[PDB]
Assembly symmetry: D2
Homo-oligomer: 122 residues x 4
């Protein structure tokens, strides 16, 4: 799925995810969020199962963005965990955790959970 | 927190997280899980906020492991999202998503969620 | 939103949620899962914000199902947390946690996370 | 575990959870949060597995609070999903989702995830 995964993806919020899948299971790229305390591209890194099951199962993968670039610092990081599904209308179906740096007092409210679906179009 | 983060960490389950923090916000290292369909070390990559707030907030960070190495493939990836807290008893407080590759029929049960606390000792 | 919420709802998996919203903030009804270790109807109870914001914000709500009825026991419970959004095509947008009873050794893998979107049709 | 569950619990934040477990699987009671936009008691309802596995597994359960009482409205609801574990140091180990009512624009940031551990003392 190296070929399947590598390229430009769009989620339901209009964010842009550009990724290269390595033969070693590496994910490298940039992420641009259509929403939140973000502007322009942020470095992402992650991993994927480079030898997935042959039974029509999806391909497990995940990656991280730290919301600091030359323009802004949101003192936060998002991790997406999900699976790539191939075929005519390929998808990456994810769930994500966004953790902010907080004081110990505010730690209980440090983390958001959500879900993003990425497609090759739109 | 490059110095603070870089090194060996242990979670409440007995797992071992060895990581180097780069000046650029990179996280790289290996993970050994004390539990689940895992043996020996797996590659990890992620990101951290290399310029956190100076108000005593923690440092946002995340990373991914894909559960394939030369020994095993568990067709799954975990992402940890959390914050590094410095001082005498330094911690990385995380929550994590573990997604398995699944069929479309089993996709609803693809993802576990949990929480890991990492310390420099035990 | 007492009127808006009360009735029959369907999620993307084909599951059926039948609920009565009380003036006091109560939710009561039954749930029928199209998937997993489930048959027929299970009791549900929950809560909703009976006096939501007047700014077009959605209505916060949650409920629980324990997966025991007269037919089966899946030694598990799901909680849905989300918001009701009114207007022409009303929705309940949720995220859910499914916890199984486990041994202390398997407790790390006790909890699934997912997302369900409920509509009045389909 | 009707007997085991019924009574007063306290979490790591110093919150108070007062619950009665019904023979039918019902949970009813009140919750007082030491943190966030909250004061005094809020109604809670939920469910638990009234006939759990006899293999030493914990008991699955869940409950909801909507953060409206006669004093305040935080336009939000929390659901706790977890398991009760019996014996000398009885625990309820939970994960939780807090959803706020939001605009469609802010819906991506609607939901916090955390974890609470409840004990009979402290
Ligand atoms: C921050 N709300
Ligand atoms: C159980 N997988």
């Amino acid at each position: 799925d190296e070929a399947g995964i590598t390229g430009t993806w769009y989620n339901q919020l209009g964010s842009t995810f550009i990724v290269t899948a390595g033969a070693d299971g590496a994910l490298t790229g940039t992420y641009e969020s259509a929403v939140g305390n973000a502007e322009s591209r942020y470095v992402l890194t992650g991993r994927y199962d480079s030898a997935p099951a042959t039974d029509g199962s999806g391909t497990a993968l995940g990656w991280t963005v730290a919301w600091k670039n030359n323009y802004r610092n949101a003192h936060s990081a998002t991790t997406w965990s999900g699976q790539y599904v191939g075929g005519a209308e390929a998808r990456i179906n994810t769930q994500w955790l966004l953790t902010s740096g907080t004081t110990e007092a505010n730690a209980w409210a440090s983390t958001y959970v959500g879900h993003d679906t990425f497609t090759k179009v739109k």
